Write an enzyme that holds these catalytic residues in place. Structure first.
Site, PDB file in Angstrom:
ATOM      1  N   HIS A  81      -3.352  17.078   3.315  1.00 53.41           N
ATOM      2  CA  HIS A  81      -3.017  16.807   1.871  1.00 53.41           C
ATOM      3  C   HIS A  81      -4.682  16.791   1.395  1.00 53.41           C
ATOM      4  CE1 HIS A  81      -6.545  13.805   4.452  1.00 53.41           C
ATOM      5  NE2 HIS A  81      -7.045  13.504   3.539  1.00 53.41           N
TER       6      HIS A  81
ATOM      7  N   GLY B 227     -14.304  11.941   2.457  1.00 51.28           N
ATOM      8  CA  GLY B 227     -14.753  13.454   2.485  1.00 51.28           C
ATOM      9  C   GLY B 227     -14.804  13.831   4.497  1.00 51.28           C
TER      10      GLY B 227
ATOM     11  N   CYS C  39     -12.153  13.533   6.241  1.00 48.72           N
ATOM     12  CA  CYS C  39     -11.430  13.989   7.240  1.00 48.72           C
ATOM     13  C   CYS C  39     -11.512  16.076   7.396  1.00 48.72           C
ATOM     14  CB  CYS C  39      -9.917  14.948   5.887  1.00 48.72           C
ATOM     15  SG  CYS C  39      -9.393  12.474   5.962  1.00 48.72           S
TER      16      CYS C  39
HETATM   17  C1  LIG Z   1     -10.475  12.296   4.526  1.00 48.87           C
HETATM   18  O1  LIG Z   1     -11.699  12.090   4.031  1.00 48.87           O
HETATM   19  C2  LIG Z   1     -10.315  10.454   4.577  1.00 48.87           C
HETATM   20  C3  LIG Z   1     -10.922  10.107   5.253  1.00 48.87           C
HETATM   21  C4  LIG Z   1     -10.614   7.915   5.221  1.00 48.87           C
HETATM   22  C5  LIG Z   1     -11.628   8.069   4.290  1.00 48.87           C
HETATM   23  C6  LIG Z   1     -12.248   6.926   4.471  1.00 48.87           C
HETATM   24  N1  LIG Z   1     -12.124   6.810   5.629  1.00 48.87           N
HETATM   25  C7  LIG Z   1     -11.560   7.429   6.006  1.00 48.87           C
HETATM   26  O2  LIG Z   1     -11.226   7.936   7.388  1.00 48.87           O
HETATM   27  N2  LIG Z   1      -8.753  10.471   4.400  1.00 48.87           N
HETATM   28  C8  LIG Z   1      -8.003   9.704   3.369  1.00 48.87           C
HETATM   29  O3  LIG Z   1      -9.048   9.197   2.414  1.00 48.87           O
HETATM   30  C9  LIG Z   1      -6.551   9.484   4.066  1.00 48.87           C
HETATM   31  C10 LIG Z   1      -5.616  10.095   2.280  1.00 48.87           C
HETATM   32  C11 LIG Z   1      -3.928  10.002   2.763  1.00 48.87           C
HETATM   33  C12 LIG Z   1      -3.631  10.892   2.081  1.00 48.87           C
HETATM   34  C13 LIG Z   1      -4.022  10.354   4.261  1.00 48.87           C
HETATM   35  N3  LIG Z   1      -5.874   7.924   3.388  1.00 48.87           N
HETATM   36  C14 LIG Z   1      -6.585   6.558   3.565  1.00 48.87           C
HETATM   37  O4  LIG Z   1      -7.504   7.175   4.610  1.00 48.87           O
HETATM   38  C15 LIG Z   1      -6.038   5.449   3.681  1.00 48.87           C
HETATM   39  N4  LIG Z   1      -5.093   4.884   4.358  1.00 48.87           N
HETATM   40  C16 LIG Z   1      -4.501   4.487   4.294  1.00 48.87           C
HETATM   41  O5  LIG Z   1      -3.246   4.926   3.171  1.00 48.87           O
HETATM   42  O6  LIG Z   1      -3.539   3.208   5.010  1.00 48.87           O
HETATM   43  C17 LIG Z   1      -1.970   2.821   4.426  1.00 48.87           C
HETATM   44  C18 LIG Z   1      -2.865   1.701   3.356  1.00 48.87           C
HETATM   45  C19 LIG Z   1      -1.819   2.020   2.333  1.00 48.87           C
HETATM   46  C20 LIG Z   1      -1.133   0.687   1.194  1.00 48.87           C
HETATM   47  C21 LIG Z   1      -2.945   0.132   1.419  1.00 48.87           C
HETATM   48  C22 LIG Z   1      -3.619  -0.267   2.505  1.00 48.87           C
HETATM   49 CL1  LIG Z   1      -4.367  -1.645   1.818  1.00 48.87          CL
HETATM   50  C23 LIG Z   1      -3.530   0.689   3.261  1.00 48.87           C
HETATM   51  C24 LIG Z   1      -7.631   4.435   3.280  1.00 48.87           C
HETATM   52  C25 LIG Z   1      -8.731   5.703   2.748  1.00 48.87           C
HETATM   53  O7  LIG Z   1      -7.533   3.569   2.669  1.00 48.87           O
HETATM   54  C26 LIG Z   1      -7.714   2.504   3.631  1.00 48.87           C
HETATM   55  C27 LIG Z   1      -6.706   1.910   4.331  1.00 48.87           C
HETATM   56  C28 LIG Z   1      -7.396   0.939   2.240  1.00 48.87           C
HETATM   57  C29 LIG Z   1      -9.292   1.870   3.672  1.00 48.87           C
END
Ligand SMILES: *[C@H](O)[C@H](C[C@@H]1CCNC1=O)NC(=O)[C@H](CC(C)C)NC(=O)[C@@H](NC(=O)OCc1cccc(Cl)c1)[C@@H](C)OC(C)(C)C
Ligand SMILES: *[C@H](O)[C@H](C[C@@H]1CCNC1=O)NC(=O)[C@H](CC(C)C)NC(=O)[C@@H](NC(=O)OCc1cccc(Cl)c1)[C@@H](C)OC(C)(C)C
Lengths: 300, 300
Positions: free
Chosen positions: A41, A137, A139
């Site tokens: 990603h 950040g 990841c």
């Molecule tokens: C990479 O640096 C980063 C690491 C995380 C940021 C904060 N703590 C971490 O470990 N990863 C991401 O930002 C990642 C990018 C996606 C494209 C993989 N996104 C997430 O970690 C989100 N998680 C997630 O999508 O869970 C499913 C979801 C979907 C819709 C609504 C909800 Cl409530 C959950 C995180 C940043 O989002 C939260 C879960 C809301 C914190």
């Protein structure tokens, strides 16, 4: 004596951490030989195959410290990106990519901008999440074990779930558990306590002289597992009994006797006492962690 | 999010660890520039001055890995030995020798035979002991903090006390607390809980979404300290209030309000709940550790 949640020394892994920037995204990569591994990603509900064919080698900015690495090729392996660079990492340790089992532990080198921030110990929960400490950040930070001089990488960080727990992949890009690297509603699913680890930790306790929870009682494996189930502990198998053999031998407490102590701890609580400085039953130490720490194994 | 007991990445310190063997004793040394620092009890109720004049440069065997270093001079600085070697450590980081205050934390790189075993976080207890994890042969393992690229060494391990806690010196060889490097009856003396750290950890809890212990109540600094004393907490000062300012500002909970929550936690217990995965009030996180972890500070 003493018992601490100990991480592996992180030096071998620190020398592999690089910064990967593409477009508006910056995260960490793992530079081994002439390949940088990083979460897919980083690339600009997505269809990452479509997204990657649109990218150019030069779109990927890789800083190893204050030295940029030239990307000369890219490919996707499941949920990780492999960025081929023209320079082999001279700090590449002997390494393997291993996938771990729920219940096993590993050290996390938390990184931001390719720079190591801290190191701590984690266990892979039965629901394939980990309870880490990851800020935005982080990841591409990796989890690992070290066996003499060999680093087994087992985890790369990808995401946080709504309960504050964390999910990621092995270094081949395959998620631990039913998670996907999309921003779609995803939930951890119910966890359980790692029974074999709790018992290992009780043996660590005896080795350090907490004995108040011991008893003259005993139980069979079956009657124990009947009580474990009520308390959302995962079943104890004969193989778990066998792995606890050495700790049983050293303390002279039969595994099934320690099960009886666990039983009473489950049914009565701790009555204001603590075990190894904890007022809860701890389940993130494997039998191996206990032996390693309570015997003094090193790594070169 | 998430909150873990995090150690500093240990790579800079791993490259300083050597093995010092003299006679029948082997322990760890810290090799910085052309000097190896190690506990003076490596040397053969003793009178170490008498004992050292009897030694020869060649009596000290120093292995840096599979390379022996030639000792060309020795001297004693309080309870540490400084072994002058003919080779400067090319891996010497920028470093300082600092003495820390009770209540402050640091990372320990536990070593055996000059080889790093594990890394974990410790606090200097109010009674100048640390609750480490040290097996026989771990002396000369060091404790440290890292500030960007500067390693502040603050602890070298010398001994275990009968309660399983650990004592040592700063890198100038001066013991933390009233201990001496002799095998004479020595006891830790009564400890207290580090109040400012508990409050910092409660702020970490709110930042991660544990809020159940918050309340509408408040208290003055005095009335708080009256309750702290009954529970063997160390007094909270206005300077501690000030250091908690940033955490107060970020969560919007006044320091004195968090004191009221601590008060009720002290008088009522936790009623089966946990805070940040603990069923006890944790006091080995400083306000700085909380900010560093909950803000993502790195080190190069
Ligand atoms: C990479 O640096 C980063 C690491 C995380 C940021 C904060 N703590 C971490 O470990 N990863 C991401 O930002 C990642 C990018 C996606 C494209 C993989 N996104 C997430 O970690 C989100 N998680 C997630 O999508 O869970 C499913 C979801 C979907 C819709 C609504 C909800 Cl409530 C959950 C995180 C940043 O989002 C939260 C879960 C809301 C914190
Ligand atoms: C250096 O490798 C080593 C590290 C300790 C070994 C086990 N865990 C450690 O942290 N240090 C020592 O062995 C050290 C050498 C002396 C010369 C400084 N000795 C101790 O740590 C002993 N402590 C001690 O002397 O306490 C006072 C004392 C005196 C007489 C009777 C009692 Cl009960 C206490 C330890 C090894 O001895 C015990 C406290 C009995 C464990």
């Amino acid at each position: 004596s003493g018992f601490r949640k100990m991480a592996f020394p992180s030096g071998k892994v620190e020398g592999c951490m690089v910064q990967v920037t593409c477009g508006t995204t910056t995260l960490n990569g793992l530079w081994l030989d002439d390949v940088v591994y990083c979460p897919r990603h980083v690339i600009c509900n997505p269809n990452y195959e479509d997204l990657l064919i649109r990218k150019s080698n030069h779109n990927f900015l890789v800083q190893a410290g204050n030295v940029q690495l030239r990307v000369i090729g890219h490919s996707m392996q499941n949920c990780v990106l492999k960025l081929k660079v023209d320079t082999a990492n001279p700090k590449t340790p002997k390494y393997k990519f291993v996938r771990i089992q729920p219940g096993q532990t590993f050290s996390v080198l938390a990184c931001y901008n390719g720079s190591p921030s801290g190191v701590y110990q984690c266990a892979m929960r039965p629901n394939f999440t980990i309870k880490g400490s990851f800020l935005n950040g982080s990841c591409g930070s990796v989890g690992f074990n070290i066996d003499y001089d060999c680093v087994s990488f087992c985890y790369m960080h990808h995401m946080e779930l709504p309960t504050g727990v964390h999910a990621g992949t092995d270094l081949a890009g395959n998620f631990y558990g039913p998670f996907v690297d999309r921003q779609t509603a995803q939930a951890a699913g119910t966890d359980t306590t790692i029974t074999v680890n709790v018992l290992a930790w009780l043996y660590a306790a005896v080795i350090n002289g907490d004995r108040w929870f011991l008893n003259r009682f005993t139980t069979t494996l079956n009657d124990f597992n009947l009580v474990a189930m009520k308390y959302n502990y995962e079943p104890l198998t004969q193989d778990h009994v066998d792995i606890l053999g050495p700790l049983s031998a050293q303390t002279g407490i039969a595994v099934l006797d320690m099960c009886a102590s666990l039983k009473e701890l489950l049914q009565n609580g701790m009555n204001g006492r603590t075990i190894l400085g904890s007022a809860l039953l701890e389940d993130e130490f494997t039998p191996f962690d206990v032996v390693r720490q309570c015997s003094g194994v090193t790594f070169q």
